[model samples]
Target: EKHFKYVILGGGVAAGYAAREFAKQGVKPGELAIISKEAVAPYERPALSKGYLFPQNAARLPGFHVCVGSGGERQLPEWYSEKGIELILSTEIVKADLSTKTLTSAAGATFTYEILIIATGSSVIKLTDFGTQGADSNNILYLREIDDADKLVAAIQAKKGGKAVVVGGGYIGLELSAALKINDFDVTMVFPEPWCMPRLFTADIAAFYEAYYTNKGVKVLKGTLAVGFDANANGDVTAVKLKDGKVLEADIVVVGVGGRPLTTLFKGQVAEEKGGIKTDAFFETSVPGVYAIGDVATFPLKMYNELRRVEHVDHSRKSAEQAVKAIKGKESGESVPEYDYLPYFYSRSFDLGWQFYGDNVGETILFGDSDPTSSKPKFGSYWIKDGKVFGAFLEGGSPDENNAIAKVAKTQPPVASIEELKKEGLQFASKI
Candidate 1:
């Protein structure tokens, strides 16, 4: 067994940040080793969904807005190499022996470490219930990894303005459909839900999007389920057959239902709930000396007094950086840090930009001048409660509004009346 001061599994965003922090704590650079299931070095995956998909449209599209000014958009693998950290790629950790603190790889390499990190972020939530070789074949692609991105880029390039079908109406599906529509593809979105972004957006907001996509030359088939796919004569995807017995002809299909947490490595050792490892404020798993971060880790929120699971780039970075400090004892605080930032997500669709803050759970209402009669691509709404704000969604606005709304989301204090707020130039809370 190889010995190391710290060993990290799954060299994704969380592992990269954790390794960086470990080195910053004056830990020897060579003392840390990162084990990854991928064959290549660790790189940013966020860009795959954003800028990397369409480099030319990167300027006109809102892809660049997703990245924070947090230095090194893709500096992870290089940074790890410069720090003298050992990177083990194309290796999978099949088992972890907690009694001896040892890890066994699928390739038979064994590692023993003083501290261990579980950062295997997530796996694509398979749609086996629907069946028919979903995402296993070409022409039907899932946009989660670099390979998926490459497939989509090639498909998009080869079939300009071709019909594309998107299954599931989550953010990923919607964003991709929008990109395809904008980049000259006849797109259609099919989902079992009656409205899009159902979990995150209210019915009104979802309806607005339905009408919005419809106007943007995107055919949205709501309240429908995808049963199977049809392959062309050349073994490429040609159409997606629906449960309703309708064959929606298309050149490609993108499955964006959701993602399953990659928590198989800690099975039987950690307390898992709904495909995620449960953690307290300190990001510790049920087993001591081991921690989960990023999408696979669910931790308690002190501000809201609730357990929240975040699957965004920002949260992954925040949690991994925090986990590193906690494990290395580099933090000066007596108590472990609890991450409780407001939830935020962004999307770009057909020359329109969307940004949402806070969770859309419980009580909600529309704010600002988002009446139905308003012009298309106009402002969106916000949900509020107890003289405090909870969530806000913006559409068809400038970056200036997003910056201001972000500040409002952080404070969430009672604002003046709608008229007064408008006078102050801030989108005020108004009833739906």
Candidate 2:
């Protein structure tokens, strides 16, 4: 049996940020412990999909670690020990009882905590999880952890100059496809959606990207599904069978369908809404002393007046810090203000990058030059609701320009004329 004043479950971005906040907020040695199934201490997970796959000077651990993701110092394993926090790596909690304030590891080790922070993050949705035929074949990969990233790196080297198929049109799919292309792989991207990133991208915006990707020699198959897989005698995936009666020959297959929050551990123990563990502004769940953050947290977005579960890295870091501040404030007889987060998301691929702020709802107005063939391609979009700008998107923007749109979205300044706004484009954001 073990006891700690505070326990953070899951050694991901949120866990590292929370531990940092705890130390800053007066947590002492033996007062905090982080339990995680991952063998390594918390690190920057976004690297797994981006910088880690670089052909040269790939980012390794102890460098791209958490806190660094937010422009802070890297929280190496030694940092955790220096702060007197226990890092129980490679430990999986098999059972959790909030009423008893206890968690049981898979090996029967029990831990009691006065305050529990759930940061299990999310798991990649696999075709095998849905029992797709031949989904268990080798050389088919999914990226969600360090091990997965390592496998992808090895696969890329083994299949260099070969054909690769990427399933899904989300950020992961796009990023992975770009990585494979960088590694000299003939890449094809397949998705059921009419265009990529349907959740945030309008057809006009997607057209620009699709054209760019096509010009890069990537074949895109839209409104299609990888119904099954073809495997060799060695159980290695050789081709992907599409629903429309087309078979794509592939030396390697990468799937990036999506992910689900890792909330099953406390399924009936806590209240859940919108497919995530429900939490208040302070990130406290319905169960007292239990807080949920990171991808698993579906907390109230004060800016949107609605509950949202943000899977982005920025929210993971900020939410963890917010929860720790709230917990410490309560102990110190102080009141921490409720969390107010502006939605932020971004992606990078092949010298192309974009950042989005605020809600993607309402009328979308495309602006600026989205000419992919241009030497300096740049463009943006504005979401107007009730005569005010509710959201903004900018591609290939400078740092100040990105910050400008973020502010515009946060303030929701009135838009006098859509035509004028379109003409002004990036200049409008710069002025704002």
Candidate 3:
């Protein structure tokens, strides 16, 4: 029967983020309630994918053992509870009847909301390929949540005497596979596509990492799909069956196919597009007093005028902060701040390091004597659209170019030709 000025669902990054923004706008902590299913407070998920893999990177140091791993006597929860925000832990919203503006919790508790922020986040997308009906199904594992990390780390230690089969050649797969190999486990990675990170970078960019991993003794299986698995009588999986009709011996299988939004609790009440919640520039849903953020929400991409969902840490943080402003009525005539920034991400596989920015780099013309082994700190390719700067990929150069592209996203500008780019100030592997 208790009511709150604002109720945030899920204690992930966005919920914690929205809590801080609400407090900054003169809202009292007592008036806000953040409810999450986990008993512990939330923590940042930015590095959850690769944090444990590499410990020496300067950026990874902050979140590494940053806390005593306890609350009240240890580390604070992921939510900014220091702002005095109240929370409901180990709880879940079972049903939400929008007609009455009510929510029924798993504990038979009910609450009415003045405003709702749905930051439910996402869960790993389970693939239909592995068909786990067999008795020995212990080998398949997902590497998305905190528990997944624990299992993977344990598997790495236990499987030091065996081979690791990592499916998918994307960021998570590549990074985690490298981690397993570092623990001295033989790793064989399979990709349904011809190259790794097919969406983020061009084949040229992807090939560099593929070659790098292969050079490091990691077996690279490009253009292969995992179809099924073979298990021993003890109910332990022994090998993975592939679409190519090959059975790969796998002591442990780490599946990183991708993730999808977890918005089932609000079905029928929220507008959806391709499993993502549809929101206006202000992050508002079709239902009044309801908002969505993080990976589950999709907004009009001004860069393309298409409704799109960006599943990245930067998107989640920016959307959560903006949603708070919308709820507080501080928004201006223009609602969303052009929800399209040049895509940027980093990866570390064993001894190789890579960073990619922009989009459609696969279509860009090669520039600056581009070769992976040339004499430069970085190499890059630009994505050209209509004779303008559409997207770009980089191996070892200033990331500032990505920002320059973002600043001119709407107005496509002609980039200096590859030859001109080198003359102007870019160098590559061959030059080095």
How does each model score on lDDT?
0.74, 0.93, 0.69
The digit string of per-residue lDDT tens for model 3 on 1-432 reads 667778888877777667667767877756888888865565566455565644345223225321222121222553346655777878788887777767788889987778888888997777664453432468677866555666666666666768888888887788877877776778899888988887776777777777767767789899998877778786677888887788889888887888889889878878899889899877888888899998999887666667878887667767888888887774443443544544455565554555544456324555544454544535566566655666645555444654443444335556556566445433322221
Please provide, for model 1 over 17-96, each residue's C-alpha lDDT reduced to its tens digit, 9 standing for 90 to 100. Answer: 77667766776766889888876565566667666666384522122221222574444455567877888888888988
Instruction: List the candidate 1 regions with Cα displacement exceeding 4 Å.
Output: 55-69, 72-76, 132-137, 330-336, 369-378, 396-400, 414-425, 429-432
- Candidate 3 TM-score to native: 0.85
Candidate 2 lDDT over residue span 1-432, tens digit each: 899999999999999999989888878889999999999999999999899999999888878888888788888899989878999999999999998999999999999999999999998999977678998899999999998999999999999999999999999889998999989999999999999999999999889889999999999888989989999999999999999989999999999999999998898999999889999999999998999999999999998899999999999999999999999999989989999999999999999999999999899998888899998888999999899999999999999999999999999999989989988887888898
Highest lDDT against the true fold, candidate: 2
Off-target runs (Cα >4 Å) in candidate 2 are: none
CA lDDT of 304 in candidate 3?
A: 61
Per-prediction TM-score to the true structure, in the order listed: 0.87, 0.99, 0.85
Model 3 segments beyond 4 Å from truth? 54-75, 78-82, 129-136, 330-342, 351-353, 368-377, 398-412, 416-432
Q: In candidate 3, which residue pairs clash?
A: 42-78, 43-78, 136-235, 374-429, 374-430, 375-429, 375-432, 378-396, 379-396, 383-391
Q: What is the Å distance of residue 172 in model 2 from its true position?
A: 0.7
Candidate 1 lands at a TM-score of 0.87
